[PDB]
Amino acid sequence: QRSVAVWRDGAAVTVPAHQPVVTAFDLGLGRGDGIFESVAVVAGRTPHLAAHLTRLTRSAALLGLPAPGDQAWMEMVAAVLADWPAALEGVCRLFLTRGLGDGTPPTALALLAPVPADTLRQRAEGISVATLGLGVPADFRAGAPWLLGGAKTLSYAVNMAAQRHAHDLGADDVVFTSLEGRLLEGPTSTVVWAAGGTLHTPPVETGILPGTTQARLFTAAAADGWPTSVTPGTVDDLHAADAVWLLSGVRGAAVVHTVDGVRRGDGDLSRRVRELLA
Amino acid sequence: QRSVAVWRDGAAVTVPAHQPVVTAFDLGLGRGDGIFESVAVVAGRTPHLAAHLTRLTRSAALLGLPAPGDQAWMEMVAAVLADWPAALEGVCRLFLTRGLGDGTPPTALALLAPVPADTLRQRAEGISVATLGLGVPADFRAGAPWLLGGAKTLSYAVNMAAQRHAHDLGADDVVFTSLEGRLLEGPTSTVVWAAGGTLHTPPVETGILPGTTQARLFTAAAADGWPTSVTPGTVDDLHAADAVWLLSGVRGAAVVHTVDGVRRGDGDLSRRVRELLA
Ligand SMILES: *Cc1c(COP(=O)(O)O)cnc(C)c1O
Ligand SMILES: *Cc1c(COP(=O)(O)O)cnc(C)c1O
Ligand SMILES: [Cl-]
Ligand SMILES: [Cl-]
């Protein structure tokens, strides 16, 4: 079961999930010209909705998209949650597109579906990853705002193509690397690794997305006395680590048990990461 | 006036242009996971449709998208052309999306609208361009098929953001450059320049789109005795040229009269380019 709400004349309107909602001329379809958020629905609630709404505002600023505001998104989330089963974990995505062009109103909607069994299983049992190069220097995106570094966009054909290429090798997911070999991020997730008693993540100044799940782990780790660091790591760091995870709003913490075909353990560190994220 | 046809149960179905046609869960919207072609409609005909359909097949191969075949696209084009005025120049776009996922059928449609007055005016009176870096080495995409070099995709948020950044400087359009400074292409067009009595264009091995308009110019130039070359040019070549154009299916030949604020003439070469493309 799926549910959709569209923002129409200053209100959220529920529409059947199978019914078309975007026209052929919507720039979100034709040019991938829009932004999104992926929000976890757990026990019929959105525990981290505000974190996603703040970043939605930031992505929309980067693309010069007029956003309808927090109250509008909360009305749309409420509309899709109305009849959602508490026992069924969901992914609520929020889309904002440029619409028919800058002048006509942007298209805003909410769409809710179950988290699939295979994503839940990756959370339970972990993932293999392939390292793929993005071809950009680590320092380049900071000086090239047209590359939309730091924006969560609808233009993810490359993100998905990287995952299909990894699937062809036998891997579940991807860690992107800069031209120099620096770790960037996953196509839809943030890389964290444990070494020397510290939790590490790559720096945002490389033009990656600031991940909300990573930020929440780091905040909890500080309160608990687990040191954290922003570290310009390489693939060598993932092999040498005590543990590696990909973090994201919906899948959550996926332990990385294989890097480019090199199997690795987690030093029994995943338990404390999961307790902190709970 | 606009017209849309959707591919439904092995036939083209005309729908009103204002009516929604894609659901919230279409991967073409949510991930920009699809390909397109932009086809000129002139005097109620598509003079170069076959060129676009061959490349559509190539883009779909790069993204692993099952394509409905030439006959299907010609039925969809015919459907949108049915009541189109011969006196009104049009842009017919063809979209193929991954649909609800690899397993459910891809979404295919055709959408036709007038070429806007401002695009026609760029064809008539020419354009200013800004040079912007893509941050990738010229040779990188050839070894990184997940970057979808050479595919005409729906994931063009960066393409459009580059144009808005150029608009902010006072420029009409963009020429992308490799990390080394090599000319790549426009966000939606192919760069050609004249120097030493030769027509030049950048090589496709840099991961650019092979442009159909550029190819057709080069073929006609050979028949007419105007030498052509694939040349790994830089921005220096555009300043030093006798003439510069951006070429594309819909806008056609747009003479570049300004590069990064440096005004330039065309050596009265545009006339022969236009005669060859006619
Ligand atoms: C969404 C996303 C993430 C993960 O961020 P969360 O806020 O933890 O969901 C990381 N990188 C990319 C590229 C993403 O799109
Ligand atoms: C469509 C397009 C072109 C132009 O190709 P034509 O076949 O001449 O329309 C060039 N570069 C990019 C990136 C394009 O999308
Ligand atoms: Cl996502
Ligand atoms: Cl285009």
Automatic annotation (TrEMBL), chains A, B:
Keywords tagged on the record? Aminotransferase, Lyase, Transferase
| Taxonomic source organism | Blastococcus saxobsidens (strain DD2)
InterPro entries this protein is in? Aminotrans_IV, Aminotransferase-like, BCAT-like_C, BCAT-like_N, Class-IV_PLP-Dep_Aminotrnsfr
Its recorded name reads Branched-chain amino acid aminotransferase/4-amino-4-deoxychorismate lyase
- Binding residues for pyridoxal 5'-phosphate, per the UniProt record? 55, 156, 212-213, 249
Residues the record lists as N6-(pyridoxal phosphate)lysine (covalent) modifications: 152
Q: Which Pfam families match?
A: Aminotran_4
Q: Which GO terms describe its biological process?
A: carboxylic acid biosynthetic process
Q: Which protein family is it in?
A: Belongs to the class-IV pyridoxal-phosphate-dependent aminotransferase family.
Keyword Lyase set for record: yes
State the superkingdom: Bacteria
Q: Name one GO cellular component term.
A: cytosol
Query: What GO annotations for molecular function exist for this entry?
Result: lyase activity; transaminase activity
